[PDB]
Design an enzyme around this catalytic site. Structure first.
Site, short mmCIF file in Angstrom:
data_model
loop_
_atom_site.label_atom_id
_atom_site.label_comp_id
_atom_site.label_asym_id
_atom_site.label_seq_id
_atom_site.Cartn_x
_atom_site.Cartn_y
_atom_site.Cartn_z
N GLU A 35 0.76 -1.26 0.03
CA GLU A 35 -0.04 -0.06 0.06
C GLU A 35 0.74 1.36 -0.06
O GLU A 35 0.36 2.25 -0.80
CB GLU A 35 -0.96 0.17 1.20
CG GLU A 35 -2.08 -1.11 1.03
CD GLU A 35 -3.06 -0.79 0.27
OE1 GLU A 35 -3.19 0.33 -0.68
OE2 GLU A 35 -4.20 -1.51 -0.14
N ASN A 46 -7.55 8.08 -5.89
CA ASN A 46 -8.51 6.86 -6.38
C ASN A 46 -9.29 7.32 -7.42
O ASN A 46 -9.39 8.81 -7.74
CB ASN A 46 -9.37 6.38 -5.41
CG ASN A 46 -8.67 5.87 -3.99
OD1 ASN A 46 -9.16 6.23 -2.92
ND2 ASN A 46 -7.72 4.91 -4.17
N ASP A 48 -12.34 7.50 -8.01
CA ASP A 48 -13.75 8.07 -7.70
C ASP A 48 -13.67 9.44 -7.15
O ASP A 48 -14.40 9.99 -6.52
CB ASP A 48 -14.54 7.15 -6.90
CG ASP A 48 -13.72 6.99 -5.31
OD1 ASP A 48 -12.60 7.56 -5.07
OD2 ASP A 48 -14.33 6.51 -4.29
N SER A 50 -11.57 10.08 -4.41
CA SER A 50 -11.38 9.99 -3.04
C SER A 50 -9.55 9.97 -2.86
O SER A 50 -8.93 9.66 -4.19
CB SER A 50 -12.19 8.82 -2.21
OG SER A 50 -11.70 7.53 -2.79
N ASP A 52 -6.55 7.98 -0.59
CA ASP A 52 -5.97 7.13 0.43
C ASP A 52 -4.82 7.73 1.11
O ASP A 52 -3.81 8.17 0.51
CB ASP A 52 -5.37 5.93 -0.59
CG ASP A 52 -6.54 4.80 -0.77
OD1 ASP A 52 -7.64 5.28 -0.72
OD2 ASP A 52 -6.04 3.78 -1.68
N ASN A 59 -9.07 5.25 3.28
CA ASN A 59 -9.74 6.00 2.05
C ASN A 59 -10.71 7.03 2.70
O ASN A 59 -11.43 6.94 3.59
CB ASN A 59 -10.44 5.09 1.28
CG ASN A 59 -11.12 5.71 0.03
OD1 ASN A 59 -12.28 6.25 0.25
ND2 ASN A 59 -10.33 5.91 -1.11
#
Ligand SMILES: [Cl-]
Ligand SMILES: [Cl-]
Ligand SMILES: [Cl-]
Ligand SMILES: [Cl-]
Ligand SMILES: [Cl-]
Ligand SMILES: [Cl-]
Ligand SMILES: [Cl-]
Ligand SMILES: [Cl-]
Ligand SMILES: [Cl-]
Ligand SMILES: [Cl-]
Ligand code: NA
Ligand code: NA
EC number: 3.2.1.17
Length: 129
Positions: A35, A46, A48, A50, A52, A59
């Protein structure tokens, strides 16, 4: 902070993640590797819209507030910036909520794609725990 592998294993174990909801410590270390590459300051956008944040790439759509993710929740009741601290406490506490949410560690797409079904004990090999 960029943690060393065993340094992070020791911190996660101190915070009670070893076998939390049945997930052995090497699962958590493997997830952190893919990650964030063990870097608390990692941020990634991301598709969408959003973002992280942190060592476990938590998120802003569901878990933390970053002030720029429409229609989003803040289920860990924390600013996303707090997930970038060199102290992993907030990340770990929030992760404990995420992994309890129903789908286990499958919430972390990188865990599902790169750790699940592998020899994750390798991630803590050689560590004094
Ligand atoms: Cl620095
Ligand atoms: Cl280390
Ligand atoms: Cl490594
Ligand atoms: Cl610690
Ligand atoms: Cl393990
Ligand atoms: Cl805000
Ligand atoms: Cl927001
Ligand atoms: Cl922006
Ligand atoms: Cl919320
Ligand atoms: Cl599970
Ligand atoms: Na990622
Ligand atoms: Na949010």
């Amino acid at each position: 902070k960029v943690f060393g592998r065993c340094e992070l294993a020791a911190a996660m174990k101190r915070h009670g993640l070893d076998n939390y909801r049945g997930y052995s410590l090497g699962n958590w270390v493997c997830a952190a590797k893919f990650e964030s590459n063990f870097n608390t300051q990692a941020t990634n956008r991301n598709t969408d819209g959003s973002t992280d944040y942190g060592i476990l790439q938590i998120n802003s759509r569901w878990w933390c507030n970053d002030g720029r993710t429409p229609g989003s929740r803040n289920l860990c009741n924390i600013p996303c910036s707090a997930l970038l601290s060199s102290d992993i406490t907030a990340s770990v506490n929030c992760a404990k909520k995420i992994v309890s949410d129903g789908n286990g560690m499958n919430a972390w797409v990188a865990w599902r794609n790169r750790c699940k079904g592998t020899d994750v004990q390798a991630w803590i090999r050689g560590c004094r725990l």
